[PDB]
Design a protein around this ligand. Structure first.
Ligand SMILES: *[C@@H]1O[C@H](CO)[C@@H](O[C@@H]2O[C@H](CO)[C@@H](O[C@@H]3O[C@H](CO[C@@H]4O[C@H](CO)[C@@H](O[C@H]5O[C@H](CO)[C@@H](O)[C@H](O)[C@@H]5O)[C@H](O)[C@@H]4O)[C@@H](O)[C@H](O[C@H]4O[C@H](CO)[C@@H](O)[C@H](O)[C@@H]4O)[C@@H]3O)[C@H](O)[C@H]2NC(C)=O)[C@H](O)[C@H]1NC(C)=O
Ligand SMILES: *[C@@H]1O[C@H](CO)[C@@H](O[C@@H]2O[C@H](CO)[C@@H](O[C@@H]3O[C@H](CO)[C@@H](O)[C@H](O[C@H]4O[C@H](CO)[C@@H](O)[C@H](O)[C@@H]4O)[C@@H]3O)[C@H](O)[C@H]2NC(C)=O)[C@H](O)[C@H]1NC(C)=O
Ligand SMILES: *[C@@H]1O[C@H](CO)[C@@H](O[C@@H]2O[C@H](CO)[C@@H](O[C@@H]3O[C@H](CO)[C@@H](O)[C@H](O[C@H]4O[C@H](CO)[C@@H](O)[C@H](O)[C@@H]4O)[C@@H]3O)[C@H](O)[C@H]2NC(C)=O)[C@H](O)[C@H]1NC(C)=O
Ligand SMILES: *[C@@H]1O[C@H](CO)[C@@H](O[C@@H]2O[C@H](CO)[C@@H](O[C@@H]3O[C@H](CO)[C@@H](O)[C@H](O)[C@@H]3O)[C@H](O)[C@H]2NC(C)=O)[C@H](O)[C@H]1NC(C)=O
Ligand SMILES: *[C@@H]1O[C@H](CO)[C@@H](O[C@@H]2O[C@H](CO)[C@@H](O)[C@H](O)[C@H]2NC(C)=O)[C@H](O)[C@H]1NC(C)=O
Ligand SMILES: *[C@@H]1O[C@H](CO)[C@@H](O[C@@H]2O[C@H](CO)[C@@H](O)[C@H](O)[C@H]2NC(C)=O)[C@H](O)[C@H]1NC(C)=O
Ligand SMILES: *[C@@H]1O[C@H](CO)[C@@H](O[C@@H]2O[C@H](CO)[C@@H](O)[C@H](O)[C@H]2NC(C)=O)[C@H](O)[C@H]1NC(C)=O
Ligand SMILES: *[C@@H]1O[C@H](CO)[C@@H](O[C@@H]2O[C@H](CO)[C@@H](O)[C@H](O)[C@H]2NC(C)=O)[C@H](O)[C@H]1NC(C)=O
Ligand SMILES: *[C@@H]1O[C@H](CO)[C@@H](O)[C@H](O)[C@H]1NC(C)=O
Ligand SMILES: *[C@@H]1O[C@H](CO)[C@@H](O)[C@H](O)[C@H]1NC(C)=O
Ligand SMILES: *[C@@H]1O[C@H](CO)[C@@H](O)[C@H](O)[C@H]1NC(C)=O
Ligand SMILES: *[C@@H]1O[C@H](CO)[C@@H](O)[C@H](O)[C@H]1NC(C)=O
Ligand SMILES: *[C@@H]1O[C@H](CO)[C@@H](O)[C@H](O)[C@H]1NC(C)=O
Ligand SMILES: [Mn+2]
Ligand SMILES: [Mn+2]
Ligand SMILES: [Mn+2]
Ligand SMILES: [Mn+2]
Ligand SMILES: [Mn+2]
Ligand SMILES: [Mn+2]
Ligand SMILES: [Mn+2]
Ligand SMILES: [Mn+2]
Lengths: 924, 690, 8
């Protein structure tokens, strides 16, 4: 919010050169000056026979805003033979990526081509150039004896680059090993010391590089984007790389260790083709000293209000914790086809709030596709999801979209003003813009009145231009301001005072200032910093009883300050802005003395009553809790009376009671202040004597951890009166009840078997299921529905194994879904295997018991037992009465033996059900 | 007996006309002092006020054009009408809604356009077997469903630039195969070969000439071709009032958007027609592959149905790709399959098996609700879609048009459309807000006392600090002139507290959170119910302590949704048929079913039990799917009588049951083949003996 | 059976 859009720095390169495609700050150690680095990949060069070689220009901020090209090479194409170019620098896109650490500058040309040493080719290996202060070395790790598509030939190394704290260069490219992509890390010292101009392929010691993998990973494009940060215990920056086409185009983000190239963590997009990992960033947003991961997916399609897909874009915010497990949120774009996650730039810290901030750009968004950049401030809870500032660059599209954003660099202070600033390149219009951060001022106003309670009959002082005596109070307002960084030692505020703001409007004003004889007064102030508010003084008076009527409505003193901004430090001019969240005004109230008794002071008697409504709320659900409040004043008038309701933790305020006509409609608002959660309701100003109000308050309680027993609500009344200003605090609690609805269900597949079985041949020693009978499957499910969970439960299955020495249902195998272990009192599948109406229950038949131990079933969970058995055919027919109808009956019961909630009343939960398989003859 | 219209509609005709749509207004001057001038209609007739001076605009929706539907898709019909009505004039007073209806039918014998997009990259050299015949075979299939069929095609390889194209030897150009010693053809991004024509003879003699080309990288970027075949109407030759089918064939995966950056291409697809007289894609080298969103937009606008015909290896990919592009279906291209004949027919049949309503250019404050009648007066609420339709079927939709306040815009017209069809329902929208007495309101502030006021039709109001019948009071010192209507009772306090009241009309606000309005200033305009942490969930406006919801949102707290899309099961049926969709979440009602879409039902009647009713109504013309006439709809499965046996096959499940005739019927159904789920019923069920 | 890029 503190970025200056009034007068930024506009830099412009040659047309069609894609000036601004890449940007970074240049901060030399040998100079106090700082510069801008701007890439121009399509720019034309002085290099012989080279068309659009590309440039990296050094732009001076101090004077004239001039830009000069840095000369890395200036050499044309080298030769393999008489006429046999060894390299092709035409349209090599040099300057497509630019990174600068201290006095080091790294610029790459991803479209640079080779032919290698063997065949005659053109292979986009890519090349970079490292230049420190004088000497310039070429760095091309993808250029080597490993070639073509199978090798590093098409790598296009230098597509993305970054520096570490240890002076290691992180260089990826997408085209390695049939576009699997790879990352290559080398120490800067190695790159400089090992450079031989006569050696086209240089082996670097201590080179950290990924290597080819299975062809399944082809066309993943690893190294599309890169970022650095340390996500393990060590102090060395580790490697973060976007790989947008991976995971069958779902997209991924790889994190590799900084010491060795071993993998650490992974990320995966939830939507295909969204190009998850198009851009990546590493910063600590929550100030926890643990770096957090930002992942762009500009093509992500979310659901509109109508439910139809729309292209917006999404940024994945992943917060690192001490354990290594990430807490990830998601931030959706706004405009369609804006490509919201295209560029993510750490601003390290913009407003000096103590927490780092960040910038996300949607290059094709904004008004008429001119581009837009969003600024997101960081907080202790992580990133603030609401952008505090919008940057919309104004440039007209001519040849192509004037992409604004798509390249950004923050986290450097070029003005030395104490605040970091931001570069945003637009390569469509071939331009780069430097936005400078305004200083932030935190100002605390204050106001009070002497005396607050006005006695209309007390005339003691006045001199209103040769006139009578009037009742006069005093208005004292205090103003202090401080800040950080560069900003002057004295500021000019313009304060405005308004008397009786409640009714000054279209009606009579009941208070005027003494000397001014006016309801309003203006003052030009001047303050200092560090503290100790400078206070002015003014005296106002009250009209006599005759001039007006109403003695009730409070007199509201309204103070408002301006702070006309003139501060420069002569740098252009730069005006500081006040703290984002801060009140431009403060108000106090005065009251005319009415019915205060013989004591000439009001002493209220305040009482607060509350009833139970629901005596029990259930620990797993969201409970419609409604408190019936009785507030009464049995004493004198209470000025600015309020009902203070303290709701701890779980409870959140819904609203007042609209439906009931016997309950008050009183306006209430939820406040969070001084690390407290409260809801305050107006009891009236004043709250008159004998007043008795009745109003309900609806709340929703979820739970806090477990074993919490009851939950508290604290109620009291407060007012502005000097004596007896409060009611005695009355606390009311409601007990947490444990209620879990648990049912058991079952089925038989099939639920019936028709005899005779088709193609039935009996063998004394059955090898397979085919030789035994059809497959009868019983399924039992124990599901917890009711809000409360349970920690442990027992499940007993009674099965009809045999009837008179003859097998009925022969159990083959049984499977379990959910948190359950099971055991059979008999051995299942002992013979192994390969591939009129009479009920037979476990009572009349030999029983096979299956005992299961169940545990931790929550509200939305459940446990299932699948029993796969064969119908024994040999038993049926024979002398068994042959044609006849049997219903095979198995039963299952469950008992819940305990709950996770301790010291709460718990009733024993039990129930049972049965599953019947009816086997009968149809031709009977 | 005061009411809503009386209190809020005091000041002016406009403030009256928008309170509730039932409110009316009165001209006159005759003189109803007290007994408010607004009220409603016949109740305003307590005092006569009979002449047109009374203002009571009535919201209406009238059909401007409705043509009858069409039985056939031939030419001698006046035109082809698949949608009735066509034009509807909608007039709305503020905060009011009228509901209209629309019928949609897919007519039989509807003309079909088919444009083939072929992948000529070297990976497809093996797959060129299926491209032979075609337009002759294309006739032998589509002849059943259509006459006046029109076909044609075009080809794509990939972007003719590095590092897609082999540039390395000079002989690699014009001959992409030099290494490996063979003959390919020079690669091309996209080229239009044969425009849509009724000649299948020319078609076959064209495709035969087509040969394979070669590029370096596996993703072939056919999405460029899909874009150009869509946005270019004249080149392809698409016919309006015809079914548009774009069939896409390839050997491997594809280039998506942003892939072109490796080639040094940063310019996004503009979705224009870049195909010139040379019949090549010109911007192929100069601009990026199109995003799914863009090609979704353009496919919908041109009413073109995209069809993916792909090899068995990559078929799983494009299926998942198709889920992001609604209205598109995928099918398997292989030598063992129903191949190209059924595939196109089955696809077109699957495309015509669904009806959903598009909405174009809908105004902001306007909102639409949809009840859908699909199967014999069933009336499914909250749904714009119809599942499991044949060709020739007709469906109905009832639509409520709700407006919140008034835009004071002149006129705007929007469109209601079946997906992928030219036939449209166009709704012209007008808003009645300004009263008919707006004309001759007098030029200036006069006619009351002196000036500084205005004149409107009943009052003339007054300026800043006059505000009276005629100009009076207001900043004077007011004696207790009267208690008049400053409270809706005697002992009741001054107007809604809030800065009290003086001399009739109340002065109330300053205030805090913004304006306080009303007769008694009882309307909050800020204070309102909250769901979680937020007023009206942020999804609705707060008017006089009441939540007026934004479009697609409903409910007292405005936390309820009109979206059924999150309630849609993988099978395509709402809540898996096992439940009802409410507030964007399925509520399951069934014998113990659960899950988001109610897809999970571990204990349920299995298999045959559900398909028993299907074979009973279809094959035996019998109970309980016969009675509700849902048989031809709810059973889409293909049932075939098999002879006295079922061969032991691949994975399958046998089923058995007794019918009303006490006979034993045996049948089986295949699980997944093409997803067909074919039924096999054994002829000669087992019956008793005599 | 085994190949990569555009080829088979
Ligand atoms: C984030 O996501 C990343 C991407 O998904 C994950 O990276 C992936 O991790 C996989 C598991 O670590 C890894 O699979 C391993 O691959 C190596 C490669 O070595 C090979 O050596 C062979 C000889 O040169 C060649 O392949 C042979 O084997 C394959 C069968 O796999 C045959 O089909 C071939 O014909 C050939 O004979 C290759 O040239 C390659 O150089 C293997 O050595 C590993 O073997 C180990 O696992 C097997 C499991 O069965 C064990 O039996 C065995 O004893 C070894 O312990 C793995 O197969 C992927 O290559 C790798 N992919 C990429 C792109 O990095 C990453 O792990 C993940 N991180 C996190 C934190 O989640
Ligand atoms: C850097 O410099 C290079 C050259 O040193 C420059 O590239 C050249 O640009 C010119 C024009 O800007 C190109 O000339 C064109 O060539 C094509 C065929 O290749 C023609 O079709 C074009 O025809 C146009 O001009 C005609 C006559 O004026 C018109 O009648 C017609 O309608 C067209 O408008 C035109 O002649 C030239 O081919 C390139 N050279 C290359 C690409 O090698 C590049 O633009 C410079 N870049 C920057 C950033 O300064
Ligand atoms: C009738 O009305 C008159 C005014 O119209 C009123 O006289 C006022 O009395 C109050 C208090 O009785 C005066 O305010 C105080 O004045 C004393 C003078 O020594 C100060 O010490 C007080 O200090 C305040 O400010 C300090 C800041 O450092 C605070 O720390 C401290 O807590 C105090 O808040 C305070 O200024 C007021 O000045 C006079 N008014 C005038 C014009 O002098 C009189 O009291 C009324 N009659 C009755 C019976 O009350
Ligand atoms: C929108 O918000 C309302 C209220 O803010 C939500 O309604 C609340 O939750 C349920 C939903 O009907 C109401 O019933 C309560 O839940 C239990 C669940 O077992 C039910 O059995 C009881 O009858 C119990 O009353 C609840 O009363 C209601 N709360 C209030 C304060 O009204 C609603 O669910 C929200 N809808 C969406 C889509 O977010
Ligand atoms: C790569 O570096 C890691 C350190 O980041 C090392 O991994 C260690 O591997 C040994 C077993 O070989 C474990 O006992 C250690 O706990 C690992 N260190 C960790 C997890 O921090 C090792 O230097 C390299 N990795 C491997 C697998 O050798
Ligand atoms: C005085 O300050 C308040 C805030 O301290 C401002 O009034 C509005 O306050 C609400 C939140 O309480 C904001 O949402 C509004 O944007 C504020 N209004 C404006 C115009 O900024 C405002 O600074 C001042 N308000 C008055 C009535 O003087
Ligand atoms: C066991 O489960 C049954 C349902 O399976 C429940 O009892 C039902 O509801 C009431 C009890 O509140 C009974 O009067 C009904 O007859 C039962 N409904 C049925 C059987 O369909 C309850 O959860 C448990 N009941 C007992 C007796 O243990
Ligand atoms: C769709 O059908 C529903 C059925 O309830 C209609 O809802 C009407 O309005 C409320 C909401 O339930 C009820 O009080 C009415 O009784 C309903 N009208 C009936 C049942 O006739 C809704 O208006 C319909 N919408 C459309 C566009 O047809
Ligand atoms: C405050 O400064 C402005 C600057 O123009 C001036 O006009 C104004 O008069 C000053 N205030 C007073 C009270 O003089
Ligand atoms: C909370 O209130 C106390 C006084 O009740 C005061 O110290 C300050 O406003 C807050 N204290 C802290 C420690 O935040
Ligand atoms: C099941 O047994 C495993 C292995 O001992 C154990 O870890 C798990 O806690 C058991 N679960 C239950 C519900 O008994
Ligand atoms: C709304 O209800 C049905 C919807 O089909 C329609 O027949 C009826 O005429 C409509 N009523 C009004 C008042 O618009
Ligand atoms: C396709 O998507 C489904 C879920 O929608 C997923 O389970 C599957 O792995 C995906 N397969 C491919 C090839 O994309
Ligand atoms: Mn590390
Ligand atoms: Mn962090
Ligand atoms: Mn910050
Ligand atoms: Mn700065
Ligand atoms: Mn007293
Ligand atoms: Mn191919
Ligand atoms: Mn193939
Ligand atoms: Mn390709």
């Amino acid at each position: 919010f503190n970025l200056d859009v009034d007068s930024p720095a506009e830099y412009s390169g040659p047309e069609g050169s894609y000036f601004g495609f890449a940007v970074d700050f240049f901060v030399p150690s040998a100079s106090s000056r700082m510069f801008l680095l701007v890439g121009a990949p399509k720019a034309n060069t002085t290099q012989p026979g080279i068309v659009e070689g590309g440039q990296v220009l050094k732009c001076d901020w101090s004077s004239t805003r001039r830009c000069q090209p840095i000369e890395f090479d200036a050499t044309g194409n080298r030769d393999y033979a008489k006429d046999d170019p060894l390299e092709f620098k035409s349209h090599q896109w040099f300057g497509a990526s630019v990174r600068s650490k201290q006095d080091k500058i790294l610029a790459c040309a991803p479209l640079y081509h080779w032919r290698t040493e063997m065949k005659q080719e053109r292979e986009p290996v890519g090349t970079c150039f490292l230049q420190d202060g004088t000497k310039t070395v070429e760095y091309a790790p993808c250029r080597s004896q490993d070639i073509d598509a199978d090798g590093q030939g098409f790598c296009q190394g230098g597509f993305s680059i970054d520096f570490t704290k240890a002076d290691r260069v992180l260089l990826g490219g997408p085209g390695s090993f049939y576009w699997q992509g790879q990352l290559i890390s080398d120490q800067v010292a190695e790159i400089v010391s090992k450079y031989d101009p006569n050696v086209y392929s240089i082996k670097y010691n201590n080179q950290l590089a990924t290597r080819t993998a299975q062809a399944i990973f082809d066309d993943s494009y690893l190294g599309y984007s890169v970022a650095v940060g340390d996500f393990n215990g060590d102090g060395i920056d580790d490697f973060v790389s976007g790989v947008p086409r991976a995971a069958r185009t779902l997209g991924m983000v790889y994190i590799y260790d900084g010491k060795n190239m071993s993998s650490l963590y992974n990320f995966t997009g939830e939507q295909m083709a969204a190009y998850f990992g198009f851009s990546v960033a590493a910063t600590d947003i929550n100030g926890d000293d643990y770096a957090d991961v930002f992942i762009g997916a500009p093509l992500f399609m979310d659901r509109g209000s109508d439910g139809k897909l729309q292209e917006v874009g999404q940024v994945s915010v992943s917060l690192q914790r001490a354990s290594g497990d990430f807490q990830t949120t998601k931030l959706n774009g706004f405009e369609v086809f804006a490509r919201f996650g295209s560029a993510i730039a750490p601003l390290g810290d913009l407003d000096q709030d103590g927490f780092n901030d960040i910038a996300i750009a949607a290059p094709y968004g904004g008004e008429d596709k001119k581009g837009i950049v969003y600024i997101f401030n960081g907080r202790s809870t992580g990133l603030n999801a609401v952008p505090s500032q919008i940057l919309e660059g104004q440039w007209a599209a001519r040849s192509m979209p004037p992409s604004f954003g798509y390249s950004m660099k923050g986290a450097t202070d070029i003005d030395k003003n104490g605040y970091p600033d931001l570069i945003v390149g637009a390569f469509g219009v071939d331009r780069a813009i430097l936005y400078r951060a305004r200083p932030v001022i935190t100002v605390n106003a204050g106001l009070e009145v002497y005396p607050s309670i006005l006695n209309q009959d007390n005339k003691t002082c006045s001199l209103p231009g040769t006139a009578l005596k009037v009742s006069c109070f005093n208005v004292r307002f205090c103003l202090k301001a401080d800040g950080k960084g560069v900003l002057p030692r004295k500021l000019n505020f313009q304060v405005e005072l308004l008397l009786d703001k409640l009714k000054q409007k279209g009606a009579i004003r009941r208070a005027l200032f003494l000397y001014s004889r006016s309801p309003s007064h203006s003052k030009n102030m001047t303050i200092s910093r560090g503290g100790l508010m400078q206070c002015e003084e003014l005296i106002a008076y009250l009209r006599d009883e005759s001039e007006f009527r109403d003695k009730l409505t409070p007199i509201t003193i309204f103070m408002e300050y301006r702070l006309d901004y003139r501060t420069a430090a002569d740098t252009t001019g730069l005006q500081p802005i006040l703290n984002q969240f801060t009140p431009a005004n403060i108000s106090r109230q005065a009251h005319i003395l009415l019915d205060c008794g013989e004591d000439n002071v009001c002493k209220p008697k305040l009482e607060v009553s509350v009833d139970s409504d629901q005596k029990k709320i259930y620990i797993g659900d969201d409970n419609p809790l409604t408190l019936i409040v009785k507030a009464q004043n049995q004493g004198e008038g209470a000025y600015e009376a309020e009902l203070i309701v303290s709701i701890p933790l779980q409870a959140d305020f819904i609203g007042v009671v609209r439906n009931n006509e016997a309950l008050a409609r009183l306006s209430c608002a939820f406040k969070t202040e001084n690390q407290t959660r409260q809801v305050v309701c107006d009891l009236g100003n004043p709250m008159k004597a004998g007043t008795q109000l009745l109003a309900g308050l609806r709340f929703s309680v979820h739970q806090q951890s477990e074993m919490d027993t009851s939950v508290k609500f604290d109620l009291q009344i407060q007012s502005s009166n000097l004596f007896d200003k409060v009611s005695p605090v009355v606390s009311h609690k409601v007990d947490l009840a444990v209620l879990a609805a648990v049912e058991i269900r079952g089925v038989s597949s099939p639920d019936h078997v028709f005899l005779p079985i088709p193609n039935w041949e009996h063998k004394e020693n059955p090898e397979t299921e085919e030789d035994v009978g059809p497959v009868v499957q019983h399924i039992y499910e124990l599901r917890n529905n009711g809000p409360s969970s349970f920690s442990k439960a027992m499940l007993h299955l009674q099965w009809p194994y045999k009837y008179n020495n003859n097998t009925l249902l022969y159990i083959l195998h049984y499977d379990i879904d959910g948190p359950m272990n099971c055991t059979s009192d008999m051995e299942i599948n002992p013979l192994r295997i390969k591939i009129d109406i009479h009920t037979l229950g476990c009572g009349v038949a030999q029983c096979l018991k299956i005992v299961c131990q169940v545990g931790r079933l929550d509200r939305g969970k459940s446990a299932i037992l699948y029993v796969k058995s064969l119908l024994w055919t040999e038993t049926f027919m024979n002398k068994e009465n042959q044609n006849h109808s049997y219903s095979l009956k198995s039963s299952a019961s469950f008992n819940v033996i305990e709950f996770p909630y301790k010291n709460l009343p718990i009733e024993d939960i039990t129930n049972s059900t049965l599953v019947t398989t009816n086997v009968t003859w149809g031709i009977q | 007996g005061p009411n809503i219209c009386t209190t809020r509609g005091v000041s002016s005709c406009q403030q009256c006309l928008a309170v509730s749509p039932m409110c009316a207004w009165c001209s006159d001057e005759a003189l109803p002092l007290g007994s408010p001038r607004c009220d409603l209609k016949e109740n305003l007739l307590k005092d006569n006020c009979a002449p047109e001076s009374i203002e009571f605009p009535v919201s209406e929706a009238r059909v401007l054009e409705d043509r009858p539907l069409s039985d056939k898709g031939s030419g001698d019909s006046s035109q082809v009408t698949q949608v009735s009505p066509q034009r509807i004039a909608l007039r709305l007073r503020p905060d009011d809604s009228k509901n209209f209806s629309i019928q949609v039918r897919q007519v039989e014998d509807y003309p079909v356009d088919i444009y083939y997009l072929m992948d000529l990259s070297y990976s497809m050299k093996d797959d060129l077997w299926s491209i032979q015949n075609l337009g002759t075979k294309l006739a032998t299939q589509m002849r059943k469903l259509t006459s006046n069929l029109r076909i044609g095609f075009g080809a794509f390889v990939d972007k003719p630039v590095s590092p897609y194209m082999y540039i390395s030897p000079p002989e690699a150009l014009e001959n992409p195969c030099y290494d490996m010693k063979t003959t390919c053809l020079p690669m091309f991004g996209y080229k239009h070969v044969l425009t849509l024509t009724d000649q299948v003879t020319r078609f076959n003699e064209e495709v035969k000439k087509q040969s394979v080309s070669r590029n370096r990288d596996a993703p072939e970027g056919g999405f460029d071709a899909i874009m150009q075949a869509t946005v270019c109407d004249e080149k392809i030759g698409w016919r309006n009032d015809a079914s548009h089918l774009l069939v896409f064939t390839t050997d491997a995966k594809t280039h998506i958007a942003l892939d072109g950056r490796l080639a040094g291409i940063v310019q996004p697809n503009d979705g224009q027609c870049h195909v010139g007289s040379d019949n090549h894609y010109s911007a192929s080298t100069t601009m990026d592959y199109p995003s799914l969103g863009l090609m979704t937009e353009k496919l919908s606008q041109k009413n073109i149905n995209l069809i993916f015909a792909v090899t068995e290896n990559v078929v799983n990919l494009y299926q998942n790709y198709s889920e992001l592009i609604p209205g598109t279906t995928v099918g398997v291209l292989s030598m063992d399959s129903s191949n190209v004949l059924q595939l196109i027919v089955d696809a077109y049949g699957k495309i015509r098996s669904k009806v959903e309503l598009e909405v174009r250019d809908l105004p902001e404050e306007l909102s639409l609700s949809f009840n859908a009648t699909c199967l014999n007066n069933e009336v499914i609420p909250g749904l714009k879609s119809c599942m499991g339709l044949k060709i020739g079927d007709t469906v109905s939709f009832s639509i409520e048009a709700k407006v919140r306040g008034c835009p004071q815009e002149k006129e705007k017209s929007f469109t209601i459309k079946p997906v992928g069809f030219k036939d449209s329902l166009i709704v012209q929208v007008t808003f009645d807000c300004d009263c008919a007495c707006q004309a001759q309101a007098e030029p200036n502030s006069h006619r009351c006392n002196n000036g500084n006021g205005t004149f409107e039709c009943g009052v003339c109001r007054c300026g800043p600090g006059w505000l009276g019948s005629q100009c009076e009071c207001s900043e004077e010192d007011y004696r207790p002139s009267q208690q008049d209507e400053c409270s809706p009772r005697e002992g009741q306090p001054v107007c809604s507290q809030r800065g009290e009241c003086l001399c009739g009309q109340c002065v109330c606000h300053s205030s805090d959170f913004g304006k306080i309005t009303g007769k008694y200033c009882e309307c909050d305009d800020f204070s309102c119910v909250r769901y979680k942490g937020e007023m009206c969930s942020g999804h609705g406006q707060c008017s006089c302590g009441d939540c007026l919801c934004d479009s697609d949102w409903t409910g007292y707290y405005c936390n309820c949704t009109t979206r059924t899309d999150t309630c849609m099961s993988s099978n395509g049926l709402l809540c898996s048929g096992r439940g009802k969709c409410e507030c964007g979440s399925c509520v399951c009602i069934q014998p113990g079913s659960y899950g988001d879409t109610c897809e999970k039902c571990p204990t349920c009647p299995d298999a045959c039990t559900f398909k028993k009713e299907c074979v009973e109504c279809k094959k035996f013309d019998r109970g309980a799917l016969h009675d509700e006439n849902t048989c031809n709809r709810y059973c889409r499965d293909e049932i075939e009588s098999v002879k006295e046996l079922k061969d032991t096959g691949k994975d399958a499940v046998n089923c058995t049951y007794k019918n009303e005739d006490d006979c034993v019927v045996r049948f089986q159904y295949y699980e997944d083949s093409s997803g067909k789920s074919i039924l096999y019923v054994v002829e000669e069920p087992e019956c008793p003996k005599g | 059976v085994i190949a990569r890029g555009d080829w088979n």
